[PDB]
């Protein structure tokens, strides 16, 4: 009782709540994963328009 | 008189399907045939696939398992009858699985 009631309770709570904290950390890195593609794929519109603007400039020539 | 038709594995070219009696079991253990090549038990056939000069072929092994007749004392926890009634279904199952394995 004396050994196991602490040897399986407290560390389990610690890993359990640190698992929620690590979930919050990797969720924050997922909030960064928003930026990881979002600021560029908001531009990808003007990217696929302006890259072909040069071929349209060859069309103007 | 539950006899079975399992196709024993004599040769690679053609293996003739033999007919053996199964369930009466001949309580000395000897599983016997259709009366004319009937087999004594513990004289077992174990087929082995080795290549001849060059080809694939099967060669039998008629290995005879030596039997230490009895343990020095050989106590029974059961009666002499119950032990056989619980043992011969086991040998029946073993022979059925062998007649599936060699047939396959």
């Amino acid at each position: 009782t004396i050994r196991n009631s602490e040897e399986l309770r407290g560390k389990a709570i610690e890993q359990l709540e640190k698992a929620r904290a690590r979930l919050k950390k990797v969720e924050m890195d997922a909030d960064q994963f928003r930026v990881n593609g979002y600021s560029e794929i908001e531009r990808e519109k003007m990217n696929l328009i302006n890259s072909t603007y040069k071929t349209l400039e060859q069309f103007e020539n | 008189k539950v006899e079975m038709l399992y196709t024993k594995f004599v040769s690679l070219v053609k293996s003739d399907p033999v007919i053996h009696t199964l369930l009466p079991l001949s309580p000395k253990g000897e599983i016997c045939d259709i009366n004319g090549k009937c087999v004594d038990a513990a004289e077992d056939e174990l087929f082995r696939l080795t290549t001849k000069e060059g080809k694939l072929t099967v060669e039998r092994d008629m290995i005879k398992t030596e039997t230490p007749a009895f343990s020095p004392i050989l106590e029974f926890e059961q009666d002499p009858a119950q032990i056989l009634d619980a043992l011969l279904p086991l040998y029946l199952n073993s022979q059925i699985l062998r007649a599936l394995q060699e047939s396959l």
């Binding site: - | 343990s71 029974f76 059961q78 009666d79 119950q82 086991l90 699985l97 394995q101």
Partner: protein, 131 residues
């Protein structure tokens, strides 16, 4: 502290290891066996082979067989054995209920032995939830 244990079966050799105790269940007795035992020859049938290795009391349920269980070199010629935790709990309980479904069928004296063996399959299966 143990014996040479060889639980065999038709197409396999289930569990060849060394264990402190052997509590195989025959019809007339659940004979506990442990080192240096005198040579007995049990007709072990349906029931659990509860063994107590010093790590834990891992149980295996065997459908039937025989055991020339002698001086630390035993050969339990088991018909059908499922070792340790290879059996699964909820499927075992549903299998017990299906064994009840096979228990109430029919036919005089011909099929009642299969009914018995289905009941005893369920007795083999109760080991799973107890494991």
């Amino acid at each position: 502290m143990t014996l040479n244990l060889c639980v065999l079966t038709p197409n396999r050799s289930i569990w060849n290891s060394e264990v402190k105790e052997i509590i195989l269940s025959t019809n007339s007795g659940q004979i506990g066996v442990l080192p240096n035992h005198a040579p007995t020859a049990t007709a072990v049938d349906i029931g659990i082979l509860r063994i107590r290795l010093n790590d834990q009391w891992l149980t295996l349920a065997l459908m039937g067989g025989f055991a020339r269980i002698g001086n630390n070199e035993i050969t339990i010629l088991v018909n059908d054995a499922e070792r340790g935790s290879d059996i699964d709990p909820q499927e075992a309980q549903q299998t017990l209920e299906i064994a009840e479904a096979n228990l109430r069928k029919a036919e005089g004296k011909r099929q009642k032995i299969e009914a018995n063996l289905a009941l005893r399959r369920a007795r083999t299966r109760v080991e799973a939830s107890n494991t």
